[PDB]
Amino acid sequence: SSMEKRFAYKFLKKILKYVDSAQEFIAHLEAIVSSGKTEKSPHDQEIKFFAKVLLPLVDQYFTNHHLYFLSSPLKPLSSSGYASHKEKEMVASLFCKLAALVRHRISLFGSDSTTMVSCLHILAQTLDTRTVMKSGSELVKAGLRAFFENAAEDLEKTSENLKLGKVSQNINYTTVALLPILTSIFEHVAQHQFGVDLLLGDVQISCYHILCSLYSLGTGKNIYVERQRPALGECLASLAAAIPVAFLEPTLNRYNPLSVFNTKTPRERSILGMPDTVEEMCPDIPQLEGLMKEISDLAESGARYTEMPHVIEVILPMLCNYLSYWWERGPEHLPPSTGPWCTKVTSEHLSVILGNILKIINNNLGIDEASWMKRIAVYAQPIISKARPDLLKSHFIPTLEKLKKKAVKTVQEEEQLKADTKGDTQEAELLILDEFAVLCRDLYAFYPMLIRYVD
């Protein structure tokens, strides 16, 4: 019969109606808070039901029937079936409305902010932007395109506040809600390959602004930056693996048909208030050659994580994802594409970057406290596949030899300590336990790369 009698359609319609009512309820609650009245809200029952039953229910429902809303006739991911166009549009609209509700009201939500953010994670991972954009009501498309604009505005406002500061609500919202949701959205559109259909035109401009703001925050020297470097690096890495414009190689941008500069008339681009040249879109972000040269100099000099805390948590993941994404669109993976490419990335760049990562891990070997290794071992996975054979003699064997020497030294010390029962053996036992802990950390920060290379 009609597709409007399905259970999922009714469920989503009911939840959308409840979210629409909760919009007014939250607006009135914020108004009464501004007025200073401390009495309970007249619709406290509705708020309690929405925050205690509706959100966890939606989260669980889309954690269970997750593939059903992503599958399509072309790709049958779910055995149960595939959601209709209207249901996918409803899911996108619900995600947009929820993101609108918590845009700056994390303080109002209080204890339910975590539940709201988890529900937003689940909805973002269950978004089919392709079908929504192809066949969806103009309101839903407008909301989806305005989500990225709102995120860009919020990030620019946070950067401005950090510069002016010598406010806390906005940084709290950015840390708690905005960054994880952006990371989830970009990972979802990168693994399912929605980037070539979603991040175009206005969305691409908003992504340019987001990229500039994230790079500015990540490499800055601030208390907030010092605390949130990992999140900024992860979000930037996710963005670099989905946006279809080579933002580190603007000189070849004329060969990229997916860029706004090559897909929009100059009058239209000037109407949108963007610079007339791609060189000015990301003025602060260096070119690919500059980043690679800086990383090589840092690795060869011997600097530790303290000297380059932003070349290890922001620049490196972005570079790894960028190289992995653009290798498949470069000279090596496009033999028949005799025409010039929008990138100049070959396996040489991936090999040299992997070698620099290994050298950096080697320099920081045995440091007392370095928790960045367990992330650098995860952000190098995309580029281990293109590593060249010469890495075996120059970078893998020396590092493993250093690790083996450390292990033999520590085990000999432990055996000699156990043999001798004189003196205070408890302090020596604690010291050797600390040494074993640092050795295990170093092994698990280098062994994954070795295993991939061997495989």
Nearest in space to 186 (alpha carbons), one of 198, 174, 177: 198
Residue 428, Cβ density class (10 Å: 0-12 exposed, 13-18 middle, ≥19 buried):
middle
Question: How long, in residues, is the chain?
Answer: 455
Tell me if 112 sits within 8 A of 49, measured CB to CB: no
Tell me if 132 sits within 8 A of 141, measured CB to CB: yes
Residue 213, phi-psi category: left (phi > 0), alpha (psi -120 to 50), beta (remainder): alpha
Taking the C-alpha atoms of residue 309 and residue 334, their distance in angstroms, rounded to an integer, is 36
- The helix/strand/coil state of 341 is coil
Taking the C-alpha atoms of residue 406 and residue 408, their distance in angstroms, rounded to an integer, is 6
Secondary structure (DSSP) of 50-89: IIIIIHHHHHHHHHHS-GGGT--SS----SS----HHHHH
Residue 138, Cβ density class (10 Å: 0-12 exposed, 13-18 middle, ≥19 buried):
exposed
- Identify the experimental approach: cryo-EM
Q: Where are the alpha helices (DSSP H) in 257-329?
A: 260-263, 266-271, 288-301, 310-313, 315-327
Tell me if 120 sits within 8 A of 135, measured CB to CB: no
Q: What is the DSSP letter of 74?
A: S
Taking the C-alpha atoms of residue 34 and residue 18, their distance in angstroms, rounded to an integer, is 24
- The helix/strand/coil state of 279 is helix
Taking the C-alpha atoms of residue 313 and residue 238, their distance in angstroms, rounded to an integer, is 13
Residue 273, phi-psi category: left (phi > 0), alpha (psi -120 to 50), beta (remainder): left
Resolution, given in Å to one decimal, reads 3.2
The structure tokens 């709102």 sit at 150
Phi, psi for residue 72 in degrees, rounded to 5 = -140, 170
Tell me if 403 sits within 8 A of 446, measured CB to CB: yes
**Would you tell me how many other CB atoms lie within 10 Å of the CB of residue 352?**
19
Taking the C-alpha atoms of residue 380 and residue 319, their distance in angstroms, rounded to an integer, is 10
Nearest in space to 73 (alpha carbons), one of 62, 63, 83, 88: 83
Report how far apart, in Å, the C-alpha atoms of 164 and of each of 157, 159, 167, 173, 337 are.
Answer: 10, 9, 10, 18, 49
Q: Where are the alpha helices (DSSP H) in 241-272?
A: 260-263, 266-271
